[PDB]
Amino acid sequence: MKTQVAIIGAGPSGLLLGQLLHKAGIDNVILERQTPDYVLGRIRAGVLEQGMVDLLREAGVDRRMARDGLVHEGVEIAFAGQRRRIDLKRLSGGKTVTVYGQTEVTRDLMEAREACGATTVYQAAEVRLHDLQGERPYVTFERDGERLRLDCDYIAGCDGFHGISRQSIPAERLKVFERVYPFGWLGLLADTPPVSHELIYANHPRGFALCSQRSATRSRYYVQVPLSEKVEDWSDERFWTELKARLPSEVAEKLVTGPSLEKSIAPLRSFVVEPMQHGRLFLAGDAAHIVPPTGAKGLNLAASDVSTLYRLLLKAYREGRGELLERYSAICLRRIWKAERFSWWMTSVLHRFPDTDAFSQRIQQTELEYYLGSEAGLATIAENYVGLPYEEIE
Amino acid sequence: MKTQVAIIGAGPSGLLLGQLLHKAGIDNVILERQTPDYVLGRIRAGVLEQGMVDLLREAGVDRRMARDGLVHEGVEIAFAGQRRRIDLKRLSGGKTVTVYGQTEVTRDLMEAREACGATTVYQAAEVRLHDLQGERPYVTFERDGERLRLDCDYIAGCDGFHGISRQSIPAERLKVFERVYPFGWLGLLADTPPVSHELIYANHPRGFALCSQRSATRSRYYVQVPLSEKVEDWSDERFWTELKARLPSEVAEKLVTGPSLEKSIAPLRSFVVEPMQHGRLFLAGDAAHIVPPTGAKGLNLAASDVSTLYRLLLKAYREGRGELLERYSAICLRRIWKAERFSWWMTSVLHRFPDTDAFSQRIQQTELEYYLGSEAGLATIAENYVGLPYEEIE
Ligand SMILES: Cc1cc2nc3c(=O)[nH]c(=O)nc-3n(C[C@H](O)[C@H](O)[C@H](O)COP(=O)(O)OP(=O)(O)OC[C@H]3O[C@@H](n4cnc5c(N)ncnc54)[C@H](O)[C@@H]3O)c2cc1C
Ligand SMILES: Cc1cc2nc3c(=O)[nH]c(=O)nc-3n(C[C@H](O)[C@H](O)[C@H](O)COP(=O)(O)OP(=O)(O)OC[C@H]3O[C@@H](n4cnc5c(N)ncnc54)[C@H](O)[C@@H]3O)c2cc1C
Ligand SMILES: O=C(O)c1ccc(O)cc1O
Ligand SMILES: O=C(O)c1ccc(O)cc1O
């Protein structure tokens, strides 16, 4: 079996890269461990930066998003009784963010890939990577007991945090940066009207709470929860009572609750590897870095990594400028570190940490008061929230 | 002995409050433990916000400052080889800061107080405060062996961090917030031309360094130093070699060194007490809060506390609105907490901390890169650096 670009993983990263490449005439094959049904069962993210919205349009997979996605011009932050709205549009110079679920984006891409007939192998077991520094790297995998080999020019590791691609680079070539937080988020998807037209991040003494949405009739809520909690200890009833306790009264009063469609606990973490490539292997998305979901940068960093990789592969194939691929990491990392700093900052001011002394609590409260009450403070949040500009390469 | 306002301490706070009050017709007596010579030997701070510059003018003690002080429109931050200038004037909407030493301000006030004949008792030993909640509080002290009593209406505790006034409030009425940093600043005063027309804060891998000044022929430099260091372990020669090692080469190359006039180590700390008053006693300056010197807010918070206390005492005496004095703490604390947050922030991004893991070092470097390269980021530093607006009271 032979292709130009082998893509490990059929999540947002792999599918988006694959569609962009296909549309440009660059053959690519995607290998996925799971079934399409399993991939479609993941709920996850719901906020898209303008940059990712444009990338989807460029990949020609935006009809459903332009119809069902909700454009948001502001977000609210609630702390100490008050609610402060950050006008993203005004403060960022006119940029907005789009709420359209990660599940929906994935379904749209899977649908577009099937229609075009590009190759996708689901249930590709025991995927292994070889000859990464050769002129001809290859991938071996198993489809129903028999071991097959796939030859290619390049390999894009879009296999997420637990993927095989990052594990295939000699550990000595990689520098890891990581921070584990002492809490996770318990999320709940409900077929109920959202409590607000815009998102609400809430810093409350009992912990963080977030009111989000997927459409006019589907809501998504999250509450900060200790690492020790098991999802089976949280009945729907317990969740609503707790969400309500963390929100301002005028918001909790008008909350329409209902049974959960999905409920899960995701732990918070920061992780970056440098470089993000080795020979003919390039990491993209969760395979290369993780951010706590507080700034909604996860799916968005995957998109920029992909936008950068795709434009560099295009130069390599169409223009014969294969040497530009050496710049991938440098380019991606500048954006990744700023998104990591923003996500770290949002996380530290909105959540309640266990070992907190009095001085730090007061500093946390003051950060909010300063950033939310100063025009310059609001602009730092806003420009970071809509997404800093993608670099153009060279 | 009888007066209207008893003032404990003849540092910047007490003298400024005393001059303002005297000029308005409100009698006040200042009690100081040390001699005038001892007070004048302290070097300390050198940066004044516009607010403090206006307060000095209002107190009529600005002739020398208007002549010898240097107005600065920007400051530089050096990190990772580069130097970035923050245009304070442009970014703050036209505000600047004035470099005029704390020693000079103190000398100017002491001179003005002597000329007007207001009462100042130096070497007032064993000062004690009594009947703080009565209608008539009083102060007792010792002048050459004999114990004297001073009756008054109000007492202003302007006695610094180790003063007796904060110690005189029942510990149970006070809430303390404090953070001790694992380093101090080794400062050096030299009769040499400063290396730059503007200040330079430097984040270097060996530690923080700061290039400041007092005039066109007098310089002040500081280097971050461990808590374990003794000043006698730092010869002038050792200091210059170390300063030079922490600065960018084009700056170190042109540094004019020379023997020290003064050299001392000051440890870094944050401290706030709430409330800042008890009965007829009001705390002002270092007696109520401490900030690390990184943001130069120490002497500046003393000035705002004083400006607030003076305007409230004026209302009380001239207008009979004695009830407004209950608002002192609330008003002062809003400004103190924002200055504390700023000083904490400056401190954490410019200094090298001992227990730092890789992720944090990268986050520290990114904070600098973001704040120094974004117009909104630069504006947060600038507005905070020139000094947030004084509240007008009511
Ligand atoms: C559990 C979890 C919860 C999240 N929750 C949120 C959230 O609530 N909000 C938010 O803002 N962000 C959240 N995120 C982040 C956001 O969803 C991710 O950044 C985004 O999914 C990244 O996309 P990706 O394509 O890089 O990886 P993924 O979506 O993880 O997809 C990678 C794919 O590779 C496949 N794969 C793995 N190993 C192999 C292999 N060995 N061979 C072949 N295929 C393989 C996997 O099956 C998977 O399909 C969450 C992420 C995770 C892991
Ligand atoms: C050692 C030190 C170094 C500093 N270095 C810097 C620096 O390098 N840069 C910078 O930006 N800021 C620095 N600061 C901070 C800045 O100088 C202070 O915030 C400023 O001096 C506060 O003024 P104040 O009037 O409140 O107190 P102070 O200047 O401390 O004066 C209070 C006065 O009260 C007197 N007193 C004390 N106890 C009694 C008593 N029991 N009875 C009567 N009188 C008493 C003291 O003798 C003293 O004269 C420094 C402060 C200190 C303590
Ligand atoms: O899923 C969401 O809708 C959501 C929204 C904002 C964010 O920060 C993280 C999230 O998971
Ligand atoms: O003394 C100074 O000149 C000086 C300047 C700036 C600052 O942050 C702290 C300082 O002590």
Which of A176, A363, A376 lies nearest to residue B376, judging by beta carbons?
A: A376
**Contact yes or no for A204/A247 (Cβ under 8 A):** yes
Among B220, B262, B268, B381, the mutation site with the greatest number of ligand 4 atoms within 8 A of its Cβ is B220
Residue whose pair of structure tokens reads 């390599």 in the numeric block = A316
The span from the CA of B229 to the CA of A91, in Å, is 47
| Shortest CA distance from A270: residue in chain B | B359
- For chain B, how long is the longest CA-to-CA vector? 64
Residue whose pair of structure tokens reads 């005028």 in the numeric block = A250
Nearest residue to B242 via CA among B218, B261, B266, B226: B226
The span from the CA of A366 to the CA of B338, in Å, is 6
Residues of chain A contacting B178 with CB distance shorter than 8 Å: 359
Structure tokens at A96: 């907005």
Q: Which amino acid is at B21?
A: L
In this structure, the answer to whether residues B260 and B336 fall within a common structural domain is: no
Distance from CA of A172 to the nearest CA of B (A): 16
Apex A303 CA angle, A302 and A308, nearest 5: 100
| Shortest CA distance from A179: residue in chain B | B359
Residue whose pair of structure tokens reads 């294969």 in the numeric block = A322
DSSP SS3 for B189: strand
Q: Please indicate, yes or no, if residue B360 is contained in any of the structural domains.
A: yes
Structure tokens at B313: 């005492």
Q: Please indicate, yes or no, if residue B216 is contained in any of the structural domains.
A: yes
Nearest residue to A43 via CA among A233, A183, A190: A190
Q: Are strands A260-274 and A289-290 parallel, antiparallel or unpaired?
A: antiparallel
Residue whose pair of structure tokens reads 């084009």 in the numeric block = B250
Residues within 6 Å of ligand 3 by CB: A 45-47, 199, 212, 220, 293-294, 296
Residues of chain A contacting B379 with CB distance shorter than 8 Å: 375-376, 379
In this structure, the answer to whether residues A50 and A126 fall within a common structural domain is: yes
Residue whose pair of structure tokens reads 């130093």 in the numeric block = B225
Report CA torsion sign: A150, A153, A159, A165: positive
Q: Tally Cβ neighbours within 10 Å of residue A286.
A: 25
Q: Is A46 annotated as a binding residue?
A: yes
A258 Cβ neighbours under 8 A, 6+ residues apart: A190, A191, A192, A236
Structure tokens at B135: 């209608």
Cis before residue B275, ω within 30 degrees of 0?
Answer: yes
Residue A270 half-sphere exposure toward CB, CA atoms < 13 A: 25
Count of domains forming chain A: 2
**Contact yes or no for A139/A127 (Cβ under 8 A):** yes
DSSP SS3 for B105: helix
Q: Tally Cβ neighbours within 10 Å of residue B68.
A: 14
Q: What share of chain B is helix, strand, coil (3-state, %, to 5)?
A: 40, 30, 30
The span from the CA of A265 to the CA of A369, in Å, is 30
Q: Is A13 annotated as a binding residue?
A: yes
Using only the alpha carbons of chain B, give its radius of gyration. Answer: 21
Instruction: Give the position, in ligand 3's atom list, of the atom nearest the Cα of A214.
Output: 3
**Contact yes or no for A379/A93 (Cβ under 8 A):** no
The span from the CA of B243 to the CA of B221, in Å, is 8
Which of A178, A358, A369 lies nearest to residue B359, judging by beta carbons?
A: A178
- SS3 readout for chain A: CECCEEEECCCHHHHHHHHHHHHCCCCEEEEECCCHHHHHCCCCCCEECHHHHHHHHHCCCCHHHHHHCEEECEEEEEECCEEEEEEHHHHHCCCCEEECCHHHHHHHHHHHHHHHCCEEEECCEEEEEECCCCCCCEEEEEECCEEEEEECCEEEECCCCCCCCHHHCCCCCCEEEEEEEEEEEEEEEECCCCCCCCCEEEEECCEEEEEEEEECCEEEEEEEEECCCCHHHCCHHHHHHHHHHHCCHHHHCCCCCCCEEEEEEEEEEEEEEECCEECCEEECHHHCEECCHHHCCHHHHHHHHHHHHHHHHHHHHHHCCHHHHHHHHHHHHHHHHHHHHHHHHHHHHHCCCCCCCHHHHHHHHHHHHHHHHCHHHHHHHHHHHHCCCCCCCC
CA dist list (Å): A124 to A32, A138, A141 = 6, 14, 6
- Rounded distance from Cα A297 to ligand 3 centre (Å): 9
**Contact yes or no for B165/B15 (Cβ under 8 A):** no
Q: Which amino acid is at A295?
A: G
Q: Which residues of B are catalytically annotated?
A: 72, 201, 293, 297, 385
Question: Which H or E run contains B385?
Answer: helix B375-386
A177·B337 Cβ contact <8 A:
no
The span from the CA of A355 to the CA of A266, in Å, is 21
- Rounded distance from Cα A42 to ligand 1 centre (Å): 9
In this structure, the answer to whether residues B113 and B86 fall within a common structural domain is: no
Q: How many residues does chain A have?
A: 394
The span from the CA of B311 to the CA of B305, in Å, is 10
Question: Which H or E run contains B283?
Answer: strand B281-283
The span from the CA of B121 to the CA of B32, in Å, is 6
Burial category of A97 from C-beta neighbours within 10 Å (exposed 0-12, middle 13-18, buried 19 and up): buried
Backbone angles phi, psi at B24, to 5 degrees: -90, 0
The span from the CA of B18 to the CA of A394, in Å, is 64
Which of B338, B357, B358 lies nearest to residue A370, judging by beta carbons?
A: B338
The span from the CA of A337 to the CA of B266, in Å, is 34
Say which DSSP state B136 is in: S
The span from the CA of B130 to the CA of A307, in Å, is 72
B350 Cβ neighbours under 8 A, 6+ residues apart: B77, B201, B202, B203, B208, B294
Residue B75 half-sphere exposure toward CB, CA atoms < 13 A: 31
End-to-end CA distance of chain B: 33
The span from the CA of B149 to the CA of B166, in Å, is 20
Structure tokens at A199: 């998102």
Q: State the DSSP string of B30-51.
A: EEESS-HHHHHT-----EE-HH
Nearest residue to A163 via CA among A17, A255, A353, A33: A33
Burial category of A23 from C-beta neighbours within 10 Å (exposed 0-12, middle 13-18, buried 19 and up): middle
Resolution (Å) of this entry: 2.1
Q: Which residues partner with A70 through β-bridges?
A: A99
The span from the CA of B1 to the CA of B143, in Å, is 13
Q: Please indicate, yes or no, if residue B64 is contained in any of the structural domains.
A: yes
Structure tokens at B343: 């000083």
In this structure, the answer to whether residues B246 and B151 fall within a common structural domain is: no
**Contact yes or no for A49/A71 (Cβ under 8 A):** no
Ligand nearest to the CA of B294: 4
Q: Is B78 annotated as a binding residue?
A: no
Q: Please indicate, yes or no, if residue A205 is contained in any of the structural domains.
A: yes
In this structure, the answer to whether residues B292 and B247 fall within a common structural domain is: no
DSSP SS3 for B272: strand
Structure tokens at B300: 């500046």
Region label for B80, one of left (φ > 0), alpha (ψ between -120 and 50) or beta (otherwise): left
Nearest residue to B190 via CA among B134, B154, B243, B228: B243
Which of A358, A379, A382 lies nearest to residue B177, judging by beta carbons?
A: A358
The span from the CA of B282 to the CA of B275, in Å, is 9
In this structure, the answer to whether residues B186 and B236 fall within a common structural domain is: yes
In this structure, the answer to whether residues A258 and A359 fall within a common structural domain is: yes
End-to-end CA distance of chain A: 33
Residues of chain B contacting A176 with CB distance shorter than 8 Å: 358
Structure tokens at A245: 């306790």
Say which DSSP state B197 is in: S
Q: Please indicate, yes or no, if residue B394 is contained in any of the structural domains.
A: no
Say which DSSP state B171 is in: T
Distance from CA of B375 to the nearest CA of A (A): 9
Nearest residue to A145 via CA among A166, A165, A125, A167: A125
The span from the CA of B381 to the CA of B378, in Å, is 5
Could you give the strand order of the β-sheet that contains B281-283, starting from the edge strand earlier in sequence?
A: B119-122, B28-32, B5-8, B154-157, B281-283, B277-278
Distance from CA of B385 to the nearest CA of A (A): 13
Structure tokens at A275: 């470089």
In this structure, the answer to whether residues B209 and B304 fall within a common structural domain is: no
Question: Which H or E run contains B332?
Answer: helix B328-350
Where residue A201 sits, what CATH number does that domain have?
3.30.9.10
The span from the CA of B32 to the CA of B56, in Å, is 21
DSSP SS3 for B191: coil
- Cβ–ligand 4 contact at B293 (below 6 Å): yes
Q: Please indicate, yes or no, if residue A362 is contained in any of the structural domains.
A: yes
Nearest residue to A3 via CA among A152, A158, A129: A152
Nearest residue to B207 via CA among B231, B225, B233, B234: B225
| Shortest CA distance from B389: residue in chain A | A374
Report CA torsion sign: A266, A267, A268, A271: negative
Ligand nearest to the CA of A298: 1
Domain span at B241: 73-95+181-268+352-388
CA dist list (Å): B196 to A77, A207, B200, B243 = 43, 48, 8, 14
Where residue B143 sits, what CATH number does that domain have?
3.50.50.60
Q: Which amino acid is at B328?
A: Y
Instruction: Give the position, in ligand 3's atom list, of the atom nearest the Cα of A220.
Output: 3
Q: Tally Cβ neighbours within 10 Å of residue A39.
A: 20
- Rounded distance from Cα A160 to ligand 1 centre (Å): 5
In this structure, the answer to whether residues A14 and A120 fall within a common structural domain is: yes
Q: Is A236 annotated as a binding residue?
A: no
Q: Please indicate, yes or no, if residue A393 is contained in any of the structural domains.
A: no
The span from the CA of B375 to the CA of A93, in Å, is 12
Q: Please indicate, yes or no, if residue A168 is contained in any of the structural domains.
A: yes
Size of interface A-B (CB pairs under 8 A): 71
| Long-range Cβ contacts of A219-222 (<8 Å, 24+ apart) | A219/A189, A219/A190, A219/A191, A219/A192, A219/A193, A219/A194, A219/A195, A220/A43, A220/A46, A220/A187, A220/A188, A220/A189, A220/A190, A221/A187, A221/A188, A221/A190, A222/A185, A222/A186, A222/A187, A222/A188
In this structure, the answer to whether residues A64 and A160 fall within a common structural domain is: yes
Say which DSSP state B2 is in: B
In this structure, the answer to whether residues B195 and B149 fall within a common structural domain is: no
CA dist list (Å): A123 to A8, A38, A109, A145 = 12, 11, 18, 11
**Contact yes or no for A243/A186 (Cβ under 8 A):** no
The span from the CA of A173 to the CA of B169, in Å, is 61
DSSP SS3 for B187: strand
The span from the CA of A357 to the CA of B358, in Å, is 24
In this structure, the answer to whether residues B251 and B322 fall within a common structural domain is: no
Q: Is A123 annotated as a binding residue?
A: no
| Shortest CA distance from A178: residue in chain B | B359
The span from the CA of A85 to the CA of B6, in Å, is 47
Nearest residue to B86 via CA among B73, B99, B74: B74
Apex A261 CA angle, A255 and A267, nearest 5: 90
Instruction: Give the position, in ligand 2's atom list, of the atom nearest the Cα of B298.
Output: 19
CA dist list (Å): A74 to A102, A381, B20, B57 = 20, 11, 47, 44
Q: Tally Cβ neighbours within 10 Å of residue A136.
A: 11
Question: Which H or E run contains B349?
Answer: helix B328-350
Buried/exposed A101-130: b ≥16 CB within 10 Å, e otherwise: bbbbbbbbbbebbeeeebbbbbebeebebe
Residue ranges with strand state E in B131-259: 138-143, 146-151, 154-157, 175-190, 200-204, 207-215, 218-226
Residue whose pair of structure tokens reads 């307060």 in the numeric block = B55
In the residue annotation, A289 being an active-site residue is answered as no
DSSP SS3 for B203: strand
Q: Which amino acid is at A255?
A: L
Report CA torsion sign: A94, A95, A100, A104: positive
**Contact yes or no for A290/A269 (Cβ under 8 A):** yes
